[PDB]
Every structure is written in structure tokens, then in C-alpha cells.
Design a protein around this ligand. Sequence first.
Ligand SMILES: Cc1cc(S(=O)(=O)Nc2ccc3c(c2)CN(C)C(=O)N3)ccc1F
Length: 127
Amino acid sequence: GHMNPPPPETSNPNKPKRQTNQLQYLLRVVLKTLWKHQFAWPFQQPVDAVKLNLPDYYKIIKTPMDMGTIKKRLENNYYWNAQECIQDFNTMFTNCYIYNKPGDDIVLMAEALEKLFLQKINELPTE
Ligand SMILES: Cc1cc(S(=O)(=O)Nc2ccc3c(c2)CN(C)C(=O)N3)ccc1F
């Protein structure tokens, strides 16, 4: 039958990780600002291709990422540096633009969240 893939890991004892003021800002300011946006909801958890009737999603998107995963990674101090976390946000946005049709509602939502994201990481503290 239909199935979702296992979600991205939010812990890995053998991964190198650190706490930095930039990673604290990425949770406290960036993630928590985007999370409260009226367009956040499709991005707050891994895509449930079964319940959302998107059977092609994991045929097209092979590096899934979502803000639920990013939130848990930040809370778990999973990252080595801010760049690793920013890369996860960028993967999430890129996947949306690859999978969905330009001008569709999901793309308008991603565009609005990405506009905010780009503003917020411009005020990333110097480490
Ligand atoms: C805004 C919106 C959402 C949904 S849905 O949430 O019910 N299904 C859904 C439909 C498409 C997507 C996603 C969810 C999530 N996602 C990250 C993505 O890239 N595409 C369907 C139509 C639609 F216009």
C-alpha cells in the first residue's frame, strides 16, 4: 500500500554539534517568528503524502525537510553551526518550488515565509 518515508532524524549521537548565539537566534527569532505565520501550517511537519493525497511527492522530493524537523533539531542542539540550519530552511523552500506549480497557493505561502526568512537571517548576530 501507500506509505510515507521515515522522517528526517532530529537526533544523532555520532553527529558533531555545538551551541552558538547564531543557533540560539535561529530558534528564538527565526523559527519561532515563521512558526506563528498564518502560512506556516503546511510546513510545520513532514509532508504526509498519504493523508494529503500526494502520492507523487516522495517520487519528486528525495531530500525532504520541514520546520517541525528544524524546530526539533534546534531544540535538540543538533547542529554544528548556523549554516547547517540555514541549509535545512533552504532545502525546505527549494523542495516547495520544485514540487508545486508556480503561482499555486503552496508556492505563494513559501514565497511569503522565504521573504521573512531572508530578512531575519540578515540580522543574524555575528558569532
Ligand atoms: C495551500 C494548500 C494546501 C493543501 S494541503 O495542505 O491539503 N495539501 C498539500 C498540497 C501540496 C503541498 C503540501 C500540502 C505541503 N507542501 C510542503 C508542498 O510542497 N506541497 C492543498 C491545497 C492548497 F492550496
